[PDB]
Amino acid sequence: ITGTSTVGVGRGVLGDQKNINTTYSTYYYLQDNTRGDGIFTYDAKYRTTLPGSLWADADNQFFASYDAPAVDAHYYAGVTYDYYKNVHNRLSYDGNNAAIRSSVHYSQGYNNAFWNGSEMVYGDGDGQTFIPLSGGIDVVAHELTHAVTDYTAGLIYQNESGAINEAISDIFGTLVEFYANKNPDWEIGEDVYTPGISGDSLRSMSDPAKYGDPDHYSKRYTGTQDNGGVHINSGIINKAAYLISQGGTHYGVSVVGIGRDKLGKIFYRALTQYLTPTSNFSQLRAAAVQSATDLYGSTSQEVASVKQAFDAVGVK
Numbered sequence: 001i002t003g004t005s006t007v008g009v010g011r012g013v014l015g016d017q018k019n020i021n022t023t024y025s026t027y028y029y030l031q032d033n034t035r036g037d038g039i040f041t042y043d044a045k046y047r048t049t050l051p052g053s054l055w056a057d058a059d060n061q062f063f064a065s066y067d068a069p070a071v072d073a074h075y076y077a078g079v080t081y082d083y084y085k086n087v088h089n090r091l092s093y094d095g096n097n098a099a100i101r102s103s104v105h106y107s108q109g110y111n112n113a114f115w116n117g118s119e120m121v122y123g124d125g126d127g128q129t130f131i132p133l134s135g136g137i138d139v140v141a142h143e144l145t146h147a148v149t150d151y152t153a154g155l156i157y158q159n160e161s162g163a164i165n166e167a168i169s170d171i172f173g174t175l176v177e178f179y180a181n182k183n184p185d186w187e188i189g190e191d192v193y194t195p196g197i198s199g200d201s202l203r204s205m206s207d208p209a210k211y212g213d214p215d216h217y218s219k220r221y222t223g224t225q226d227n228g229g230v231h232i233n234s235g236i237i238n239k240a241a242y243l244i245s246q247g248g249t250h251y252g253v254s255v256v257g258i259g260r261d262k263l264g265k266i267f268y269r270a271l272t273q274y275l276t277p278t279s280n281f282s283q284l285r286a287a288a289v290q291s292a293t294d295l296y297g298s299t300s301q302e303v304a305s306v307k308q309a310f311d312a313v314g315v316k
């Protein structure tokens with residue numbers, strides 16, 4: 001919409017108050033003109049037709065419970081845009097400031113959120129398994145990161161390349177959660193998963209086996225479910241990424257951590273310069289080693305740690 005840029009105030013899914021960038025033109029819309037070609041938030045009104053209508057509000061105050069998921073989808077797309085721009089010098093997901101569109105209130109009782117190749121889509125959850133999924137900054141950033149992967153490596157969504165695609169999204173969704181310093185951790189989806197149980201999450205990067213996902217290549221799922229285990233076998237890479245960052249001993253192999261910042265720089269380089277659509281886990285190791293080499297030298301501690309981490313999870 002064409003109008004004046006302004007700032008509104010609302011409450012997110014978890015009850016926190018935040019300011020959001022809006023546009024005024026008769027109504028106040030969830031349109032943030034300050035980032036790239038814009039961040040746009042739509043109401044899918046419990047239907048599955050997309051994108052729905054651009055979110056319009058009469059007084060720029062978003063404190064209704066129906067507004068909550070929109071507030072957070074709009075705000076957390078802005079934080080994810082800022083992370084990629086400030087940390088990695090990338091302007092939006094295509095690297096050329098493409099507009100970011102999200103629709104909330106998709107369908108009824110829908111326990112999922114996803115990047116559909118053109119925009120973000122978020123369900124409200126059924127209220128037991130999930131609450132509205134845009135309340136989870138690691139969820140928003142995990143899904144928005146599929147857009148970057150799609151424009152760069154293009155990892156296909158099946159077998160080992162799909163599991164790498166998923167792990168890359170968990171890694172960067174976690175780094176965005178640490179960048180916003182929103183109670184950060186190495187778990188995924190804990191702010192929006194099961195409102196009635198404290199302390200769990202959908203997946204864990206520091207210990208994938210806590211929820212039954214593999215944490216070593218010898219425990220990888222080889223059947224056909226879940227497009228060959230894309231959400232299951234990502235635990236092997238997530239554990240490798242956690243060890244590169246934090247360090248630790250895993251199945252007797254010791255890794256000296258190099259921290260989150262270097263973890264993000266290595267994986268971002270690996271993703272945008274060496275991964276291809278059919279890369280497998282072994283090619284991922286090679287790409288991460290080559291990236292660390294590029295950045296820190298072939299005889300650095302950083303290359304040594306990337307090697308130890310992949311060795312610890314059985315990827316050669």
Ligand SMILES: [Ca+2]
Pocket residue numbers: 057058059060061062063
């Ligand atoms: Ca209002």
Ligand SMILES: [Ca+2]
Pocket residue numbers: 177182183184185190191
């Ligand atoms: Ca957290």
Ligand SMILES: [Ca+2]
Pocket residue numbers: 138174177184185186187188189190
């Ligand atoms: Ca988390």
Ligand SMILES: [Ca+2]
Pocket residue numbers: 190193194195196197198199200201
């Ligand atoms: Ca929970």
Ligand SMILES: [Zn+2]
Pocket residue numbers: 142143146165166169
């Ligand atoms: Zn994903």
